[PDB]
Amino acid sequence: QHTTIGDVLREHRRSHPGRTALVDGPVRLTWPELDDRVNRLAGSLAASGIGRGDRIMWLGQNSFRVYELIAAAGKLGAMVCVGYWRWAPPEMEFALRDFDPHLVVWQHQEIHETVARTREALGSDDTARWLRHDSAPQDPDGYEAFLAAGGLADPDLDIDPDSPVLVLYTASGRQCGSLLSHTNLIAMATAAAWLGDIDHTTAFLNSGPMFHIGNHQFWGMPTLLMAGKNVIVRRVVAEEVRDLLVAEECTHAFLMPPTVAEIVRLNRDTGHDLSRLRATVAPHLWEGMATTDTSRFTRSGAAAGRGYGQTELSGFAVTAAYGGPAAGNAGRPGPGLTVRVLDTAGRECAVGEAGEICARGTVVHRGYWNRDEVNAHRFRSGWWHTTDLGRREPDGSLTFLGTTTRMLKSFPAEVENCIEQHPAVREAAVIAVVVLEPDAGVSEQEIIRIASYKKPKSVAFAAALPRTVSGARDYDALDKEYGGGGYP
Amino acid sequence: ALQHTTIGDVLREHRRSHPGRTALVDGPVRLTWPELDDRVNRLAGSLAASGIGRGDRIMWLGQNSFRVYELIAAAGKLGAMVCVGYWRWAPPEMEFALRDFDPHLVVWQHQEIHETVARTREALGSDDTARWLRHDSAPQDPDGYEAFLAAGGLADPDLDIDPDSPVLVLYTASGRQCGSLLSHTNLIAMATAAAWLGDIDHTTAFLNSGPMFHIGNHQFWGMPTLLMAGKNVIVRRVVAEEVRDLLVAEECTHAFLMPPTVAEIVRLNRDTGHDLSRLRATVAPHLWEGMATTDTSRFTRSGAAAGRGYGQTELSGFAVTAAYGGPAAGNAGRPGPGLTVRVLDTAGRECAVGEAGEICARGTVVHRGYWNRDEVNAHRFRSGWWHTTDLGRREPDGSLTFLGTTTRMLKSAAENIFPAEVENCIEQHPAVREAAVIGVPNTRWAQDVKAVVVLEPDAGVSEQEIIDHCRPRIASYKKPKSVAFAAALPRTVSGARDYDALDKEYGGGGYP
Numbered sequence A: 001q002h003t004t005i006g007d008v009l010r011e012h013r014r015s016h017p018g019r020t021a022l023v024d025g026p027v028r029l030t031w032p033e034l035d036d037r038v039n040r041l042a043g044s045l046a047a048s049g050i051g052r053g054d055r056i057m058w059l060g061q062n063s064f065r066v067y068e069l070i071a072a073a074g075k076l077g078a079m080v081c082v083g084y085w086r087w088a089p090p091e092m093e094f095a096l097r098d099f100d101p102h103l104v105v106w107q108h109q110e111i112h113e114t115v116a117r118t119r120e121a122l123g124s125d126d127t128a129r130w131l132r133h134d135s136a137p138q139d140p141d142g143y144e145a146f147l148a149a150g151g152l153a154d155p156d157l158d159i160d161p162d163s164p165v166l167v168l169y170t171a172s173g174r175q176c177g178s179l180l181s182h183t184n185l186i187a188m189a190t191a192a193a194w195l196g197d198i199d200h201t202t203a204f205l206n207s208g209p210m211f212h213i214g215n216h217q218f219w220g221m222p223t224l225l226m227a228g229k230n231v232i233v234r235r236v237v238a239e240e241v242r243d244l245l246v247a248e249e250c251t252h253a254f255l256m257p258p259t260v261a262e263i264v265r266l267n268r269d270t271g272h273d274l275s276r277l278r279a280t281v282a283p284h285l286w287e288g289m290a291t292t293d294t295s296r297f298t299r300s301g302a303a304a305g306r307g308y309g310q311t312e313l314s315g316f317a318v319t320a321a322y323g324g325p326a327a328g329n330a331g332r333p334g335p336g337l338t339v340r341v342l343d344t345a346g347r348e349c350a351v352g353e354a355g356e357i358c359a360r361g362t363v364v365h366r367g368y369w370n371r372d373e374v375n376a377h378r379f380r381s382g383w384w385h386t387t388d389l390g391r392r393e394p395d396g397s398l399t400f401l402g403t404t405t406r407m408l409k410s411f412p413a414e415v416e417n418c419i420e421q422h423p424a425v426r427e428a429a430v431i432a433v434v435v436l437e438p439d440a441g442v443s444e445q446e447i448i449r450i451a452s453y454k455k456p457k458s459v460a461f462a463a464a465l466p467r468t469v470s471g472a473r474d475y476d477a478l479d480k481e482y483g484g485g486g487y488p
Numbered sequence B: 001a002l003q004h005t006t007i008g009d010v011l012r013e014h015r016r017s018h019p020g021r022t023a024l025v026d027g028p029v030r031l032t033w034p035e036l037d038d039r040v041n042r043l044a045g046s047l048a049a050s051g052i053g054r055g056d057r058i059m060w061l062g063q064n065s066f067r068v069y070e071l072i073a074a075a076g077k078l079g080a081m082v083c084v085g086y087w088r089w090a091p092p093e094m095e096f097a098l099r100d101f102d103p104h105l106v107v108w109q110h111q112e113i114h115e116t117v118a119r120t121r122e123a124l125g126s127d128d129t130a131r132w133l134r135h136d137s138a139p140q141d142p143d144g145y146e147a148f149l150a151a152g153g154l155a156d157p158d159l160d161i162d163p164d165s166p167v168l169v170l171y172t173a174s175g176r177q178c179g180s181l182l183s184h185t186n187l188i189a190m191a192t193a194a195a196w197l198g199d200i201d202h203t204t205a206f207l208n209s210g211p212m213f214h215i216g217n218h219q220f221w222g223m224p225t226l227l228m229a230g231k232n233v234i235v236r237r238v239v240a241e242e243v244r245d246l247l248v249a250e251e252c253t254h255a256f257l258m259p260p261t262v263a264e265i266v267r268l269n270r271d272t273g274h275d276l277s278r279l280r281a282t283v284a285p286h287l288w289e290g291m292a293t294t295d296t297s298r299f300t301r302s303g304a305a306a307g308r309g310y311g312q313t314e315l316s317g318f319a320v321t322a323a324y325g326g327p328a329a330g331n332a333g334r335p336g337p338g339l340t341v342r343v344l345d346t347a348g349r350e351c352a353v354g355e356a357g358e359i360c361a362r363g364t365v366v367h368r369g370y371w372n373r374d375e376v377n378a379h380r381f382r383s384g385w386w387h388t389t390d391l392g393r394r395e396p397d398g399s400l401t402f403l404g405t406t407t408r409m410l411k412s413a414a415e416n417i418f419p420a421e422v423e424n425c426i427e428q429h430p431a432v433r434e435a436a437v438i439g440v441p442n443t444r445w446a447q448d449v450k451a452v453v454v455l456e457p458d459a460g461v462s463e464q465e466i467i468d469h470c471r472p473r474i475a476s477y478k479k480p481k482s483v484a485f486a487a488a489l490p491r492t493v494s495g496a497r498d499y500d501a502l503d504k505e506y507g508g509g510g511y512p
């Protein structure tokens, strides 16, 4: 009987009878209050037929209710998919038909237009109960009234913690729902508690999106595991965030640089105490208004990106924080993971040789929802295949080179990377389009470590790279411009 | 979906991630992680060629050695388990242990215990079917561990081992000894929690000066060191200058040391120049008189280093500590990750706040059971809870208090009393150093509560003043009839309380 998420809540209610667990605007909950609510919720779920292996889709922004649902589903051996709130109806429809939830918890604010249309496209296939979460607390088709109708008795079920409990859709087109078990999350949060020096006094601002692994690992689940206080913001607004930092005495946040600079300018000279916040990302941009984190997470450079990982490995499973100075850009595996770089023929690559990053261990997810064939192939031979490219340095460390999905017939990323190991190059795209540093300047011929055949026969130069509306690299934009066709 | 991490995986990852880091030192033996994994693979090879596979059993009958780690890992790569037996076992219990555990293989030691060994084999007679390999042998002894190992090939066994299966067995002593079956998962979880408590990493150098037959040395800090790829330095026995020199030579950050050795180290190192400043002092920091660096980890800061905790072998060690959850009214603190706890009454209903009952547990640190104890395991695991046979209570602030044992009980017309409850509340009195409670026959159905009280040398207190002290925290029907005073409680040669002796001295009897 291994520890489940349910056990974690049942222990914190007895061990921390008066400490704040969740805060969400006006709502505040101690661990007892939360466990009672999770028990009510789990009562009404078991009432509506939800049990082992059943499925729930959250369709909204960040909410304290996400944590509650996860716990309740966990206590029944069910799973919650925290879906993408910005999905247009085609994608939203796809996920619904894919994940096939028995119940859909949804948000009116912001997306009701899209939600409404999508249900109409589903028509008579929409055999799921929908509860509005941001409803008036009386609403009969409402979350709060769904929960209140349940009783306080913990269902006390013997749940296999290897059963999935959190499903994250991972984003070459098609989206797939990664199955993260109770064990995946607890193994992740214990690792993370060591990286961050996280404890019961940790107050963490959930300003990162819960539809994605980032916010969960740093630091949602570890804060939760160690009994810290998780504070929820629906949206990131610099003023409100800055305000919560003071009010909840927050020690950690999930903040991106543009937000931070917004808080800095805005807080300057007003004298509010932001010194309790341990800043992880880009410490200098705070100027000193907050305290520079000295946990291994920041010290090592993992906070700035020194690491490798993915949703399917419960997030950031390899960092410069495990094992010390590393020549490679990602560091080494933390505990609960073993990695090997494998070539085409499934054999271990030699030191320096590039291949696919493959993993086994406790942090490796359970597979994708409803992807039998992709799972069989990705789990071949008792290794999870990440589809990412890497190599081992002689010092032991690992280097993340890029993806293996983008391919050229006899890998681009491998050379994209080699090219970006020129001081004059800022970034490169190989199909070899090149964006140079503003100050440097170098010959196409100097550009042209790798093998006789792998080098391209041409190098264009751009002011920057094309990019999608999300801001990620846009390749099919410049497959056109520079002659890109014939792809295997 | 694939298996969880094993002990074999840990080694496999370290040999790739830390090719030149030192893993094990033992006298002149030094081993980087690749050198250790190749050794383990050879040993695993010869173990498999001898017929050792899943479920099979190896007994170590010796003091601390680097080879012990080698066996654990090698047995773990085959799905086998290693029992680290008590080297100071006398022949009768060496036999019992060998009969009970029934290993296919015995790795034994000649220095200091050979005679005992010789006597025990004689006693086993023609049920002594195991292969015996001498660890500290002449290096070309064919019945010696080194040559047995060198017969193995370098290939990894590369089996799909279930990490829930036992890999380490520690005997825990009524006087009945039982082998606690600890899985790969038990030790990795323990190790992972310990890494957070003591801030352990790859730079850790832990001197293995505690005994490896006991969970202590493993939790602090053998296994977390191993897990985070740090250096493990072994010592066979605990002699202070040896220890002193090895702290200096190997630059250890950590060592397992009780206060008697600390005090002798501090004398011998008195004006020598020797640098012990690397050592982070966890036990009795003041005793070093500045010579080592007081530990700032959560382990020391919380009092957990000084015994503010609760646990046992069956929970993979110290699983409840003041380091988990901050300041605590109870003496034990709170459960770590990997563990939930409840205080259950005699009917199995959960006691109320402040009410004394059996400490019971669930979670990842809980052991797989005792080896070869079907009826007891079935009883001790009743209801999906591990019953610890320890008595405690939850406090108003959610912290836990370890009161003592439930193995002793007094007869009562109301409901059987736990002497450990009364003992504890008497031991609260600030003038009392220790208290022991026995039962005096009072008809067939009950015994009188009799207290034997050891005072602090400079304190006064009457029988009545002690009795009065308990009134508010224990029920009327539990309070003692009489109090006797002693200079010290009698003990065994093991230094455990001798309740048999007290019974005798003050007319105790008529227990359940």
Ligand SMILES: C[C@@]12CCC[C@@](C)(C(=O)OP(=O)(O)OC[C@H]3O[C@@H](n4cnc5c(N)ncnc54)[C@H](O)[C@@H]3O)[C@H]1C[C@@H](O)[C@@]13C[C@@H](CC[C@@H]21)[C@](C)(O)C3
Pocket: A170, A213, A214, A218, A302, A303, A304, A305, A306, A307, A308, A309, A310, A311, A312, A315, A316, A386, A388, A400, A402, A403
């Ligand atoms: C979110 C984190 C942690 C989990 C992995 C990851 C990568 C992520 O976005 O997960 P994913 O989208 O589900 O899938 C991952 C896919 O991204 C590629 N990748 C792998 N390691 C990478 C790295 N080192 N850089 C950039 N890309 C990387 C690879 O091809 C893989 O398949 C990171 C991005 C990372 O910049 C941060 C965001 C933020 C919080 C933690 C990480 C932080 C502190 O600023 C760092």
Ligand SMILES: C[C@@]12CCC[C@@](C)(C(=O)OP(=O)(O)OC[C@H]3O[C@@H](n4cnc5c(N)ncnc54)[C@H](O)[C@@H]3O)[C@H]1C[C@@H](O)[C@@]13C[C@@H](CC[C@@H]21)[C@](C)(O)C3
Pocket: B172, B214, B215, B216, B219, B220, B283, B304, B305, B306, B307, B308, B309, B310, B311, B312, B313, B314, B317, B318, B388, B390, B402, B404, B405
């Ligand atoms: C060894 C450690 C860690 C593992 C648990 C334990 C207790 C132990 O010795 O395990 P065991 O041989 O299986 O005995 C278990 C039986 O001990 C009783 N017990 C429970 N919590 C206790 C506590 N708080 N005090 C005294 N006794 C306690 C109870 O009845 C239980 O069943 C400790 C004793 C502890 O004094 C230390 C030794 C040393 C290293 C770590 C711990 C250190 C830093 O000084 C602390």
Ligand SMILES: [Cl-]
Pocket: A379, A380, A381, A382
């Ligand atoms: Cl396969």
Ligand SMILES: [Cl-]
Pocket: B110, B111, B112, B113
């Ligand atoms: Cl001898």
Ligand SMILES: [Cl-]
Pocket: B475, B476, B477
């Ligand atoms: Cl009373």
